[PDB]
Design a protein around this ligand. Structure first.
Ligand SMILES: *[C@@H]1O[C@H](CO)[C@@H](O[C@@H]2O[C@H](CO)[C@@H](O)[C@H](O)[C@H]2NC(C)=O)[C@H](O)[C@H]1NC(C)=O
Ligand SMILES: *[C@@H]1O[C@H](CO)[C@@H](O)[C@H](O)[C@H]1NC(C)=O
Ligand SMILES: *[C@@H]1O[C@H](CO)[C@@H](O)[C@H](O)[C@H]1NC(C)=O
Ligand SMILES: *[C@@H]1O[C@H](CO)[C@@H](O)[C@H](O)[C@H]1NC(C)=O
Ligand SMILES: *[C@@H]1O[C@H](CO)[C@@H](O)[C@H](O)[C@H]1NC(C)=O
Ligand SMILES: *[C@@H]1O[C@H](CO)[C@@H](O)[C@H](O)[C@H]1NC(C)=O
Ligand SMILES: *[C@@H]1O[C@H](CO)[C@@H](O)[C@H](O)[C@H]1NC(C)=O
Ligand SMILES: *[C@@H]1O[C@H](CO)[C@@H](O)[C@H](O)[C@H]1NC(C)=O
Ligand SMILES: *[C@@H]1O[C@H](CO)[C@@H](O)[C@H](O)[C@H]1NC(C)=O
Ligand SMILES: *[C@@H]1O[C@H](CO)[C@@H](O)[C@H](O)[C@H]1NC(C)=O
Ligand SMILES: *[C@@H]1O[C@H](CO)[C@@H](O)[C@H](O)[C@H]1NC(C)=O
Ligand SMILES: *[C@@H]1O[C@H](CO)[C@@H](O)[C@H](O)[C@H]1NC(C)=O
Lengths: 113, 287, 79, 44, 50, 99, 113, 49
């Protein structure tokens, strides 16, 4: 229930959108306009270096907002972020991939074209 | 009949970790070179499992009435057959059908009845003077009995009644389940040379007997056997010996398991789906 | 079960015809790719092509199969 | 939006900046080398 | 009424079995009843074994 | 080989899914149609039979649609391969970065 | 119920395959392992020379194993087999076609490329 | 019946998206050929570029 910036006419109780979903309801306690947004977004994904290469994995959340790196394609945990760029093999989305390099651990970086 | 014990210094129970243990056949079909996943109560891998001692050197003797959940895992690194059997029930006051699965020196005896169960039943072994052999004489498991229906004997099972203090040489695992009142037994003897920290090797469990009882259950407790040699005065108050043994009690939970059936037809691996993200990735791809 | 299937016999007719069309389309795909020529040309017995070694793509008489060593390596690679 | 009912939209692997970079690289190759860069090393 | 050259699927072939076997065991168990006849001695007619 | 392996694995998994569809009840009280006939009378068990018919019809229709789309993709790839054969194999093609 | 060559563990009665189909049941007579294979396979098919050419046909079964010629693509009856090879017109499968040649009857042969 | 209706709607949407994806794949193949021919060289195909 976020703080909205749009006011209603003084005769309405609900509020819908273009997609016809009730996402705005006036609070009867103090006539406060509050927005509605669902919490569960997307699923989970697992980054695996492969068989006979490593054993540890990295878990990627699709559209969930949060070692731990907040990428543009959700939340990525279990893979450290490094500023340099190499050629990427395991795609993730939004221009950043993940790989297993140098011990050695799973890293995430912006791909090189 | 049964007698009461005397208060003494005991040892608190410890907690240990399982390593790929508690895997049995969930059905009675043949599967070869296929990775089949089933929903059934198994023991989760790498879970903190309870540990109970049975060694003398001190005077450790603990037999709590643990609650019987939906399936239990009973593993013992038995060496000199110190443990004897198991008893079951809800209140143990001759009001319900309490089980008694014991293994005497001549034959296995399974009889669920309404035995007048005491506070701490046990098996007593006495060392004869003229005879250099350990023989069981104190058969104090219940006070009396009134009525029951089921009784099973099966084939005779021979065990050794002599207790030692050396290292263990065998490992026995048992799984007890109750689905729709049907009693399930899964066991397999496995040789090993270790004292603790159960190996990471894999071994499935095959059913032995499948009992159609259909009764009520919620609690369980194990039975132990102590020795009465010439060193101890022979009274069950403060002086006794129990040899050296260790049994593990684990509780089964409903998790999906991906089994590895080889070309021969036996389970080889039991990769989970709710333990590790890598295991979930393995079991979602069925590979 | 068959008595209630007369109410949906037309659906099974469409499904069977679609599968037959898929099968004959798969059959016609091989005729459009490999059957480009209507004359089978024999490889000459002379293997002196100015130094170009063609044994890895031409069939070999050492094996009963007509596949090339590249094709035999290709057949076993896929399942 | 269209995401409130579980209809999540997957972001593309390549952003618009990377596509623009690819187009600029192709443009530079086709004005500085012609077709040599498309069939081998780039020749001035 | 006119059929051209080619392959055509008309119907299906089903091999209907003609015999059925439903015997579950190889033999059933017995109970001790031969001692009624295989006995050392029998009873009389005024008081017979039941 | 990636291209040659997908066309076999997809068909095999579609066949496996078709087999798996017969293990579901589609909201009925049984999966196998013989069990309901043996345990219930045909006048009463007609609705369960019809529900199973509708479920199997839906699964078969989805399989047919998937196979038709796969066949269209295979037809496009076969046309591309035939053109590649007739250009790059049966002569020399002037199209740059095509062969 | 064929005679299998795979032994069963002494606690099982049924048996399935990769595709999850019961195809191996242990017979409780003297503990024999017997496989299960359906007897009905495929459907029937007909070879027709066409109109204004002939009146007889040749019945072809898709995969049923048996004047009568045992082809690779099932069972073909009503069409004799000849060892020579010509260009084929009516496809059957597995490199074998059918045609109406020299009186004259329906013949089956391996196609010529 | 709600399950069946939602399943039917989802299946129809998936079929429409698959057909659209096939058309997009054909268009992308055409665009790739155009990029390889008209851009990465000079194409002798008349009325193609
Ligand atoms: C063409 O290439 C093949 C490679 O397969 C050559 O065959 C090899 O020849 C060497 C030299 O004697 C042998 O040691 C290898 O065992 C051969 N391999 C095989 C698979 O046959 C062949 O000699 C070459 N021919 C020409 C004319 O260059
Ligand atoms: C994620 O949440 C944190 C704290 O709740 C917030 O500071 C951050 O702006 C959020 N990220 C986005 C993209 O809104
Ligand atoms: C490298 O990454 C760190 C991470 O915060 C950043 O502060 C730094 O500016 C980066 N350096 C370069 C050259 O990108
Ligand atoms: C040991 O067991 C307890 C209770 O089951 C549990 O809370 C604890 O996390 C376990 N120890 C470890 C290291 O997981
Ligand atoms: C062993 O115990 C059983 C009861 O559990 C009893 O029936 C049997 O007679 C005992 N054996 C001996 C030798 O006393
Ligand atoms: C045994 O006796 C009790 C009476 O205390 C009775 O409730 C119970 O039903 C009896 N069991 C059987 C199997 O008859
Ligand atoms: C079995 O026990 C449960 C509670 O544990 C009780 O609700 C149920 O009525 C009992 N059934 C019988 C047949 O005694
Ligand atoms: C299982 O049977 C196969 C085939 O007879 C054999 O090769 C294999 O060794 C057997 N496995 C075991 C553990 O005996
Ligand atoms: C009785 O004994 C005879 C011989 O010992 C034997 O053949 C027979 O089967 C037994 N039983 C009956 C019912 O005759
Ligand atoms: C078949 O029946 C006989 C009794 O006539 C029995 O001895 C034998 O063990 C049976 N075979 C089995 C159970 O395989
Ligand atoms: C067809 O059946 C005959 C006799 O039943 C047998 O000899 C032949 O091997 C079978 N053909 C095949 C391909 O199995
Ligand atoms: C065809 O000719 C070959 C020549 O060796 C012979 O072996 C074969 O039997 C002939 N087939 C027929 C059907 O006459």
């Amino acid at each position: 229930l976020t703080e909205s910036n749009k006011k209603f006419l003084p005769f309405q109780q609900f509020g819908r959108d273009i997609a016809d979903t009730t996402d705005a309801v006036r609070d009867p306690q103090t006539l406060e306009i509050l927005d509605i947004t669902p919490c569960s977004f997307g699923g989970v994904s697992v980054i695996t270096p492969g068989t006979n290469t490593s054993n540890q994995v990295a878990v990627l959340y699709q559209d969930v907002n949060c070692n731990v790196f907040q990428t543009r394609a959700g939340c990525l945990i279990g893979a450290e972020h490094v500023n340099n760029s190499y050629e990427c093999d395991i795609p993730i989305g939004a221009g950043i991939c993940a790989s297993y390099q140098t011990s050695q651990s799973i890293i995430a970086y912006t791909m090189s074209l | 009949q049964c007698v009461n014990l005397t208060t003494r210094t005991q040892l608190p129970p410890a907690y240990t970790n399982s390593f790929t243990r508690g895997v049995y056949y969930p059905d009675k079909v043949f599967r070869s070179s296929v990775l089949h996943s089933t929903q059934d109560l198994f023991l989760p891998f790498f879970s903190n499992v309870t540990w109970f001692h049975a060694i003398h050197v001190t005077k450790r003797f603990d037999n709590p009435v643990l609650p019987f959940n939906d399936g239990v895992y009973f593993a013992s690194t038995e060496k000199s057959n110190i443990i004897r059997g198991w008893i079951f029930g809800t209140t143990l006051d001759s009001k319900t059908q309490s089980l008694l699965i014991v293994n005497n020196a001549t034959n296995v005896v399974i009889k669920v009845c309404e035995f007048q169960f005491c506070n701490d039943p046990f098996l007593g072994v006495y060392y004869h003077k003229n005879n250099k052999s350990w023989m069981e004489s104190e058969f104090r498991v219940y006070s009396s009995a009134n009525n029951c229906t089921f009784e099973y004997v099966s084939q005779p099972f021979l065990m050794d009644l002599e207790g030692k203090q050396g290292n263990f040489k065998n490992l026995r695992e048992f799984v007890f389940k109750n689905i729709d009142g049907y009693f399930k037994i899964y066991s397999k003897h496995t040789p090993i040379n270790l004292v603790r920290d159960l190996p990471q090797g894999f071994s499935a469990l095959e059913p032995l007997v499948d009992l159609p009882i259909g009764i009520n259950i919620t609690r369980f407790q194990t039975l132990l056997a102590l020795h009465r040699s010439y060193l101890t005065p022979g009274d069950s108050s403060s002086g006794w010996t129990a040899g050296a043994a260790a049994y593990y009690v684990g509780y089964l939970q409903p998790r999906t398991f991906l089994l590895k059936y080889n070309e021969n037809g036996t389970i080889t691996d039991a990769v989970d789906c709710a333990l590790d993200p890598l295991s979930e990735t393995k079991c979602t791809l069925k590979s | 079960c068959s008595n209630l299937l007369l109410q949906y016999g037309s659906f099974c007719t469409q499904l069977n015809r679609a599968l037959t069309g898929i099968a004959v389309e798969q059959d016609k795909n091989t005729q459009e790719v490999f059957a480009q020529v209507k004359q089978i040309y024999k490889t000459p017995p002379i293997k002196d092509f100015g130094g170009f070694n063609f044994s890895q793509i031409l069939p070999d008489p050492s094996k009963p199969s007509k596949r090339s060593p590249i094709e035999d390596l290709l057949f076993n690679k896929v399942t | 939006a269209q995401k409130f009912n579980g209809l999540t939209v997957l972001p593309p692997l390549l952003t618009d900046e990377m596509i623009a970079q690819y187009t600029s690289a192709l443009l530079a190759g086709t004005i500085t080398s012609g077709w040599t860069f498309g069939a081998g090393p780039a020749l001035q | 009424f006119t059929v051209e050259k080619g392959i055509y699927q008309t119907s299906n072939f089903r091999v209907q079995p003609t015999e059925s076997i439903v015997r579950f065991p190889n033999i059933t168990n017995l109970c001790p009843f031969g001692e009624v006849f295989n006995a050392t001695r029998f009873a009389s007619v005024y008081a017979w074994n039941r | 080989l990636g291209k040659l392996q997908d066309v076999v694995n997809q068909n095999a998994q579609a066949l496996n899914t078709l087999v798996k569809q017969l293990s579901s009840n589609f909201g009925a009280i049984s999966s196998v149609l013989n069990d309901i006939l043996s345990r219930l009378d045909p006048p009463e068990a007609e609705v369960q039979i019809d529900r199973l018919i509708t479920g199997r019809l839906q699964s078969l229709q989805t399989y047919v649609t998937q196979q038709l789309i796969r066949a269209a993709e295979i037809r496009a790839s076969a046309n591309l391969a035939a053109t590649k054969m007739s250009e790059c194999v049966l002569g020399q093609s002037k199209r740059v970065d095509f062969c």
